[PDB]
Amino acid sequence: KVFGRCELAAAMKRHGLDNYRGYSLGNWVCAAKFESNFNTQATNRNTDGSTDYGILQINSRWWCNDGRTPGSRNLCNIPCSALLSSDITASVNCAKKIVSDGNGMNAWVAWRNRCKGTDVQAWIRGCRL
Ligand SMILES: [Cl-]
Ligand SMILES: [Cl-]
Ligand SMILES: [Cl-]
Ligand SMILES: [Cl-]
Ligand code: NA
Ligand SMILES: [Rh+3]
Ligand SMILES: [Rh+3]
Ligand SMILES: [Rh+3]
Ligand SMILES: [Rh+3]
């Protein structure tokens, strides 16, 4: 499913991400835009053979099982395919664990390079929230 910007903002809010670990909703929306362009089916292979899945590009090296990432963990206790669903529950719940890891949203390199320090509130401008 490809979300609209305000649709995703709404879904993220409903699932408790607005100011989760201190990150305002616009941070999460900005991260989603640059990680997946709001496409739940997004996948990208990493150089090390791990794969990133879903709206927030969660990595199989630590967070989900895809059966093809040697030596990896599955810390969200889910198949990586769960991260591709039109229902963002699995992605959000896993994101909450990631962001709680110690390094906040720096875990998402595109967040650090493209969202961090910017006017992230623009990402939720005009949404009925
Ligand atoms: Cl957009
Ligand atoms: Cl914001
Ligand atoms: Cl594996
Ligand atoms: Cl933080
Ligand atoms: Na894994
Ligand atoms: Rh929904
Ligand atoms: Rh808010
Ligand atoms: Rh890499
Ligand atoms: Rh399995």
SS3 of the chain: CECCHHHHHHHHHHCCCCCECCECHHHHHHHHHHHHCCECCCEEECCCCCEEECCCCEECCCCCECCCCCCCCCCCCCEHHHHHCCCCHHHHHHHHHHHCCCCHHHHCHHHHHHCCCCCHHHHHCCCCC
- Print the domain residue range for 129: 1-129
Confirm or deny that 101 is annotated as ligand binding. Answer: yes
Q: List the CATH number of the domain containing 82.
A: 1.10.530.10
35 is an active site residue? yes
Residue 127 CA to ligand 2 center (angstroms) comes to 11
Alpha-carbon span 18 to 67, nearest angstrom: 32
Q: How far is CA 115 from CA 24, 28, 79, 87, 98, in A?
A: 12, 9, 28, 24, 17
Q: Is 18 a catalytic residue?
A: no
Structure tokens at 12: 């993220």
| Resolution (Å) of this entry | 1.8
Cβ proximity of 58 and 94 under 8 Å? yes
Query: Residue 68: is it exposed, middle or buried by C-beta count within 10 angstroms (0-12/13-18/19+)?
Result: exposed
Total domains in the fold of the chain = 1
